[PDB]
Every structure is written in C-alpha cells, then in structure tokens.
Symmetry: C10
Subunit: 75 residues, 10 copies
C-alpha cells in the first residue's frame, strides 16, 4: 500500500517532464508561422493551417505524457 | 502515510521541471514577433495575434505541469 | 511484490521523458514546411508529403516510449 | 515527521530546475530585440514594448517554479 | 530477487530516454530535406536518398536504446 | 535529523542546476550584442544598455537558484 | 549479490542516455550535407566523404555508451 | 554522520552539472566574436572587450556552482 | 562491500551521459566544414585541419567521461 | 565507511555530466572558426587565436567538473 502509492505519485510528477517538448515545439511552429508571414504576407492563408496542424501534432506528445500522469494519479 | 506524503512533495518539485519548456517557448514566439516586425514593420497587426495565440498554446503546457504540481501538493 | 509494483510505476513515468524528442521534432519538421512554402509557394505539393513522412517517423520514436510506459503500467 | 521534512527540502531544490527556462528565454527575447534594432534602428519604439511583454511572460514561468519552491520550504 | 526485478523495470524506463535523440535527429534531417528542396527543386532526386540514409542512421541509435530496454524487460 | 540534514545538502546541490540557464542566457545576450554591433557599428550606444538589461534579468534567475541553495545550506 | 546485480541493470539503462547525442549529431551532419548539396550541387563528391567521416565519429560516441551498457549487462 | 557525509559528496557531484551552462555559454560568446570579426574586421577592437565581459559573466554562473560544490566537499 | 560495488556500477553508467556532448559537438564541427566548403570550395585544404583539431578537442571531453567510467568499472 | 565510499563513487560519475558543456562548446567555437574563414579567408590569422582562447576557456569548465570527479574518487 505505502510504497505503491508513493511510487504512483513520484511517477506522476516525472510524467510531466516530457511536456517541455510540446512547450518548445508549439513555439517553434508559431515562430516559423510568424517569420514566414513577415517575409511573404500573401502566403498567410496557406501556412496558417500548416501551423495549426504542426501545433496539434506536437501538443499530442504532451497529451500522452499527461495521460500517463493521470493514470498514475487516479487509474 | 510518511512515505506517501514525502512522495507527494518530491513529486510536486519534479512536476515543475516541465515549465522550462513554456519559458523557452514563449520566448521563441516573441523573438520571432520581434524579428518579423523588424524585417517588415507593416506586418505587425497581422503577426501580433499569431504571437498571442502561440504564447497561449505554449503556456498551456506549463499550466498542465503546475496543475499536477498543485494536485500533488493539495489535491 | 510491492517493491516491483513500485518500480513499474516509477519506470512508466520515466518512460515518458523521451516523448519530449517527438514534441520538439514534429515541430522542427513543420517549421521547415512553413519556411519552405513561404520562400517558395510553388513547392508545396512536393514538400508536404515529405513533412508527413518526417513527422510520422519522429513521432514513432515517442510512441515506442509510450509503448514501454504501457507495458510497465499494465 | 523527519522523512516528510527531508522530502520538502529535496523537492524545493528540484523545484528550481525549471528556472533555467526563464534564464534562457529572457535571453532569447533580448537577443531578438538587439538583432531587430541593429537591422532596423527605426523600429525600436515598436519592438521594445513587445520585448517587455515577452520576457515578462517568460520570466513568470520561473516565478511559478519558485512559488512551489517556497511553498515547500515554509 | 524483488530488488533485481525492480531494477529491470526502472532500468527499462530509463533506457527509453535516449530515444529523444532519434526523435529530434530524424526531424533535423527531414527539415533540411524540405529546406533544400524549397531553395532548389531540381536537387530533390539527389538529396532525398541522403535524407533516407540520415534518418536510418539516426533511427538506429533509437533502435539500440529500445534493444537494451527490451533486454531488461524480458 | 541525519535524514533532514542530508536532504538539505543534496537539495543544495540540486538547486544550482538552474544556473546553467543563466550561463547560456547571458551568453545569448552578449552574442547578439556582438553580432548587432558588427553588422551596424553606429547602433552600439543604443543596444549596449539593452544588453546590460538582458544580462541582468537572465542573471536574476541564477540569483534565485543560488538563493534557494544558500537557504538550504544555512 | 542481488543489490550488485540490481545496480548493473539500472546502470545499463542509464548508460544508453548518451546515445541521444549520436542520434542528434548524425542528423546534424546529414542536415549540413543536404543543405550544402542544395546550395552547390557540384560540391557533392567533395562533401560526401566528409559527411561519412563526421557521422562515423559522432556515432562512435554512442557505441562507447553501448559498450558500457553491454559490459554491465553480461 | 555517515548519511550526512554521503549526502555532502552526492550533492557536490550534482553541484557541477550547472557548469555545462558556462561551457556552452562561453563558446556562444566567442562564436559571435569570430563571426562578427569575419564579417567586419574593422570592428574587432570594439567587440573584443564585449566578448571578454560576456565570457566573464557567463563563466561566473559556473563558478557559483563550483563554489557550492566546494562548500559541500570541505 | 555490496553497496560500494553497486555504487561503482551505477556511477559507471552515469559517467557515460557526458558523451552526448562529444556526439553533438563532433557533428557540429563537421557540419560547419561541410557548409563552409559548400560556400567556398577553394578553402577546403585550409579548414579541414581546423575541423580535425576541433574534432579532437571536443572528443577529448568524451574521453575523460569514459576514463572515469572505466576507473569505476575496473580501477 | 560503506555508505560514504559508495556516495563518493556515485558523486564522481555525476561530476562528469557537466563535461557535455565543453564537448558542445569547444565545437561551437571551431564551427564559427570554420564558417568565418570560409566567408573571409584573409581573416584567418586574426580569428584562429580567438578560437584557441574560446576553446581553452570553455574547456576550463569541463576541467572543473573533472577536478571534482577526481577529488571524490581519490581525495
Ligand atoms: C492533439 C489534439 C489537440 C487539439 C488540436 C486542435 C486543433 C484545432 C484548432 C482549430 C484548435 O482547436 C484551436 C487553435 O482553435 C484551439 O486550440 C482552441 C480550442 C482554443 O480555444 C484557442 C482558439 C485558444 O484561444 C486557446 C489559446 C485558449 O485560449 C486556451 C484557454 C487554451 C489552451 C490550451 O492549451 O487548450 C488545450 C489544447 C487546445 C488541446 C489541443 C489538443 O486540448 C486541450 O488539452 C488537452 C490535453 C493536452 C495536454 O493535450 C485536454 C486537457 C483537453 C483539451 O481540450 C486544451 C486544454
Ligand atoms: C491557455 C493558458 C494561458 C492563456 C493565455 C491567454 C492569452 C491571451 C492574451 C490576450 C492574454 O490575456 C494577455 C497576453 O493579455 C496576458 O497574458 C495578460 C493577461 C497579462 O496580464 C500580461 C499582459 C502581463 O502583463 C503579464 C506579463 C503579467 O504582468 C504577469 C503578472 C503575469 C504573468 C503570467 O504568466 O500570468 C499568467 C498567464 C496570463 C497565464 C496564461 C494562460 O494565465 C495565468 O497563469 C496560469 C498558470 C500558468 C502556468 O499557465 C493560471 C494560474 C491562470 C492564470 O491566470 C496567469 C497568472
Ligand atoms: C513577470 C514578473 C517579473 C517582473 C517583470 C517586470 C517587467 C517590467 C519591467 C519594467 C521590469 O520590472 C524592469 C526591466 O524594469 C526591471 O527588471 C526593473 C525592476 C529593474 O530595476 C532594472 C532597472 C534592472 O536593471 C534590474 C535588472 C536591476 O539591475 C536588479 C537589481 C534587479 C533585478 C531583478 O531581476 O529584479 C527582480 C525581478 C524583476 C523579479 C521578476 C518579476 O521581481 C522582483 O522579485 C520579486 C520576488 C522574487 C521572489 O521574484 C519581488 C521582490 C519584486 C521584484 O522586484 C526583483 C527582485
Ligand atoms: C536503422 C533501421 C531503420 C531502417 C530504416 C530504413 C530506411 C529505408 C526507407 C526506404 C524506409 O524503409 C521507409 C522510409 O520507406 C520506411 O520507413 C517505410 C517502411 C515506412 O513504412 C514509411 C513509408 C512510413 O510510412 C512510416 C511513417 C510508417 O507509416 C509508420 C507506421 C512507421 C513508423 C516507424 O517508425 O516505423 C519504424 C521505422 C521504419 C524503423 C526504421 C529502422 O523500423 C521499425 O522500428 C524499429 C525500432 C526503432 C526504434 O528504430 C524496429 C521495431 C523495426 C521497425 O520496424 C519501424 C516500426
Ligand atoms: C540581477 C542582479 C544582477 C545585477 C546586474 C547589474 C547590471 C548592471 C551592470 C552595469 C553591472 O553592474 C556590470 C556589468 O557593470 C557589472 O556586472 C560589474 C559590476 C562587473 O564588475 C563587471 C564589469 C565585471 O567586470 C565582471 C565580469 C567582474 O569582473 C566579475 C568578477 C564578476 C562576475 C559576476 O558574475 O559578478 C556577479 C554579477 C555582477 C551579478 C549580477 C547581479 O551580481 C553578483 O552575483 C550575484 C549572484 C548571481 C548568481 O546572480 C550576487 C552574489 C551579487 C553579486 O555580486 C556578482 C558576483
Ligand atoms: C562508427 C561505427 C558505425 C559504423 C559507421 C560506418 C560508416 C560507413 C558507412 C559505409 C556505413 O556503414 C553505411 C552508411 O553504409 C551504413 O550504415 C550501411 C552499413 C547500411 O547498410 C545502410 C545502407 C543503411 O541503409 C542502413 C542504415 C540500413 O537501412 C539498416 C538496416 C542498418 C542500420 C544500421 O544502423 O546499422 C548498424 C550501424 C551502422 C552500426 C554503427 C557502426 O553498426 C552495426 O551494428 C554493430 C553492433 C552494434 C552493437 O552497434 C555491428 C553488428 C556492425 C553493424 O552493422 C549496424 C547494426
Ligand atoms: C584527443 C582525443 C582524440 C584524438 C584525436 C586525434 C585526431 C587526429 C586525426 C588525424 C585522427 O587520427 C583521425 C581523424 O584520422 C581519426 O580519427 C582516425 C584515427 C579514425 O580511424 C577515423 C578516420 C575513422 O575512420 C573512425 C571513424 C573509425 O572508423 C572508427 C572505428 C573509430 C571511431 C572512434 O571514435 O575511434 C576513437 C577516436 C579516433 C578517438 C579520438 C581521440 O580515439 C580513440 O577513442 C578513445 C576514447 C574516445 C572516447 O575519445 C580511446 C579509446 C583511444 C582511441 O583510440 C578511438 C577508438
Ligand atoms: C584551460 C586549460 C586548457 C589549456 C589550453 C591551452 C591552449 C593553448 C593551445 C595552444 C593548446 O595547448 C593546443 C591547441 O596546442 C593543444 O591543445 C595542444 C596541447 C594539443 O597537443 C593539440 C595541438 C592537439 O593536437 C590535441 C588535439 C591532441 O592531439 C590531443 C591528444 C589532446 C586532447 C586534449 O583534450 O588535450 C587536453 C587539453 C589540451 C587540455 C587543455 C586545458 O589540457 C589537458 O586536459 C586537462 C583536463 C581537461 C579536462 O581540462 C588535463 C587532463 C591535462 C591536459 O593537458 C589535455 C588532456
């Protein structure tokens, strides 16, 4: 009981480390969005859906970390 | 219940590591906003809302980290 | 049995660290896609499938992490 | 009592690691300000408030880490 | 032998960490492929096999991590 | 209380890790200062105070780490 | 006996972390090859052997990590 | 006393991790110096003292790590 | 003498982490050699020895790591 | 005795982690050396002493890590 619960909680905190990837990744995408629109304003409608897609896929990796975090805390 | 409490506190500490991602990310987004507007002043009103969106989505990964940290501390 | 179960749950958490690589990586690919299309719009149809391939291969590395995490969890 | 107290101190230390993001991120913002102003001095008044907003938001992530640190310490 | 099995599981979790390098690496390669084809479309057939090669070699390093991870798990 | 004092010392060691962000950040700022003055010498008096400011803010994050580190040591 | 055996398995896992350098480094080399060949296709024959030398030396660092890993395992 | 002494020696080792920041940082500064002088030789006397200032401030962050390491060691 | 042996083995593992530095570093040096020669073919004979020197000095940091690893394993 | 020796050896392995900084740093310097000479071959004699200095200072940080490593192992 003690040792198992404690491990679940240490694990849950550790599980949030991977989120740093999405934090950096989402930003890399929006940076490219911003620089690409600055260089070529007319391409805006083409690249904005590309940035939304990029962000969502990168964010999905953080979600998977958070899922493990929640499984440990609750499941 | 000593070992479990101890684990909650170490876990809360560990849970904040992931915030370094939003720290760097938010900065990356604003860096691009600054560089983009330097190269092309007239694009400001178009890219500023993109930088705000980018900020918010990168920040969210930090929010999740802190949420787990506070669930371990208090929840 | 407690100690082993404890080790399984610690390990499962540690197994997610590697996902930061796919997070950053997937983004590096889409960043290139966006910059490449901004500089040269006519190249879009050629590079978009290259970005899909690149994203998928990068993500897979993180899915192998998740796989190990689930093996330990369950 | 003593094991819990020990954990608080270890946790307080671990809690400062994330401050490295703010340290790097603040620098990233000022780097762009400097490079932006060098390439186009006349844009200074426009980008300075952007740089202020940027580093303030980046620094805040570090203060959140420090918030947990001081919660664990006191 | 609770201690030994425990060590195998934690060690299996740790072994996946190195996969992040493959995640970032693979992305670095496809990013360059995309940027290179954008700047010079006619170079596509020459650089695409180079990109496959770079992906494979970078991926190999992920394979070795997963290999040690599976050896500890089974 | 061997356990508690132990925790203070390990925790003091961990608290210095975040200093690496200040180490890299400060460098990022001076790098940009140097690159900016190289490209545009006449901008020196305008960007130099910006660089001092960026250094100070990035350094502050290191200060907070050392602060938690000293609080645990004493 | 069992504590030492446990340590070997944990150590074997930790030992694969450094493979992330080779994973990223191999990619860095191929990225430069691709970008170099895109900007100047006629330099291909000159830079390819350089890229081979570069990634071989970078990959070797990862094999040294793996050498320790397998020493600890067997 | 053993446990505390053990914690001092573990902590001292951990206290050196932060030095990686000054290692990378000092290099970032000199890289800028070299690139700035290559692009604009006549700027050398102006930027060289800026590089000295930047290197010294970056290094100091790593010396504060070493300071903590020595406090724990002795 | 179980705890000490155990510590030698974990320490040896930890000692290899630092090799990721030479891995990335060596690559950085060769990347620059490749990009430099692409931009200016005629500089090859001048920069190749610089790349070799650069390789050797970055590699040395890995050598020291592995040296400590082997001292813990065997010495 | 046991616990102290074991800690010294775990510490020594941990002490080599910072070396990754010099591994990457030395390389960053030689990269700039190579790209700067490629762009402007005539500046070679001015920047090469700058790269030697940069390398030595960056390498000094790795030395400090290795010093701690050796103090733990032997001192
Ligand atoms: C891989 C699936 C991702 C979905 C991508 C969807 C892309 C489509 C586009 C059009 C989006 O929906 C977009 C840009 O409109 C969008 O994000 C919407 C929903 C959002 O309201 C936008 C407009 C917005 O203004 C943001 C910045 C909002 O102000 C802020 C409160 C939300 C931040 C956030 O991170 O949301 C998460 C994210 C959408 C993520 C996105 C997940 O979802 C949330 O986070 C997940 C778990 C995280 C860790 O993945 C969970 C808590 C529930 C969520 O709803 C949520 C919590
Ligand atoms: C989806 C997540 C994020 C949502 C962002 C939405 C952005 C839209 C734009 C228009 C914002 O409203 C914006 C740019 O105006 C803005 O940030 C405002 C509110 C802000 O006051 C700006 C201008 C400001 O001056 C900042 C720097 C302020 O001085 C400083 C004290 C706050 C920093 C900070 O990080 O706050 C958090 C952040 C808004 C974050 C941002 C959350 O929210 C707070 O922090 C979160 C936790 C963090 C870790 O996300 C939580 C405690 C609730 C918060 O109020 C808050 C506490
Ligand atoms: C997003 C939140 C951060 C604030 C951002 C504010 C942005 C707006 C602009 C105007 C700034 O305040 C800015 C750039 O002017 C600025 O930093 C001012 C305050 C500063 O005096 C300038 C002139 C300066 O040169 C600084 C770097 C000075 O050399 C040095 C002695 C102070 C450094 C410092 O980092 O202050 C802290 C930090 C802003 C932090 C970070 C807060 O705040 C301080 O510490 C906190 C508490 C600790 C726990 O953070 C509290 C005492 C208030 C503080 O003064 C303080 C302790
Ligand atoms: C160092 C050996 C690597 C081999 C590289 C070979 C390169 C040659 C090129 C032409 C490939 O065959 C290529 C690009 O066509 C290719 O990968 C094909 C087979 C692949 O189906 C492509 C087209 C594809 O669409 C991908 C995105 C596919 O849809 C997706 C489900 C697979 C992702 C993936 O990561 O697969 C791994 C990868 C090929 C890796 C790559 C291994 O293999 C797999 O993963 C490895 C383990 C990982 C961690 O290395 C192991 C389980 C064996 C695998 O099946 C597999 C599981
Ligand atoms: C957020 C507050 C920071 C203040 C920034 C102020 C910026 C304004 C500008 C004009 C400075 O005063 C500046 C550039 O002139 C300056 O630093 C002067 C005082 C300094 O002597 C310069 C010229 C110098 O030559 C340096 C390289 C000096 O030779 C070297 C021995 C000092 C390195 C150093 O890191 O000092 C720390 C730093 C100023 C830091 C900077 C703190 O302060 C010291 O270190 C901090 C702790 C660290 C981890 O922040 C603490 C012990 C107090 C310090 O004395 C000090 C210890
Ligand atoms: C610096 C040492 C590394 C070698 C570098 C060599 C550079 C020279 C060039 C010619 C290469 O060999 C190169 C690019 O041609 C190449 O990789 C060849 C071998 C490969 O067949 C090419 C065509 C290829 O597409 C690969 C990526 C293929 O798709 C895939 C199935 C094999 C991947 C692989 O990474 O092989 C390993 C790796 C080179 C490693 C890394 C060794 O070697 C292999 O594994 C080792 C043992 C394990 C523990 O490393 C042993 C069995 C020999 C191997 O084949 C092997 C297992
Ligand atoms: C100061 C440290 C380094 C010294 C470098 C000197 C460089 C000068 C130039 C001229 C070299 O001789 C150079 C470029 O020709 C060269 O590396 C040769 C020897 C090498 O065979 C090259 C061409 C080669 O083909 C490599 C990729 C070879 O195929 C592969 C099997 C070896 C990889 C490797 O990393 O070896 C180590 C490296 C030379 C390193 C490099 C050491 O040495 C070896 O590894 C070290 C340990 C590592 C971690 O440093 C130790 C076991 C002794 C070694 O022989 C060796 C084992
Ligand atoms: C901060 C002081 C540094 C000194 C910098 C000196 C700069 C001046 C220039 C001219 C150099 O001396 C230089 C470039 O000529 C040079 O390095 C010489 C000595 C070297 O022989 C060069 C020419 C060379 O060919 C190298 C690549 C050689 O083949 C290879 C075997 C040495 C690798 C190496 O890392 O040496 C270390 C380094 C000089 C370092 C350099 C330390 O010294 C050694 O490593 C230190 C500890 C490390 C961790 O700092 C210790 C083991 C003893 C050493 O001699 C040594 C072990």
């Amino acid at each position: 009981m003690q040792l198992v619960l404690a491990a679940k909680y240490i694990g849950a905190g550790i599980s949030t480390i991977g989120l740093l990837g999405a934090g950096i990744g989402i930003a890399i995408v929006f940076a490219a969005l911003i620089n690409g629109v600055s260089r070529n304003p007319s391409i805006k409608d083409t690249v904005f859906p590309m940035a939304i897609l990029g962000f969502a896929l990168s964010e999905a990796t953080g979600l998977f970390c958070l899922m493990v975090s929640f499984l440990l805390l609750f499941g």
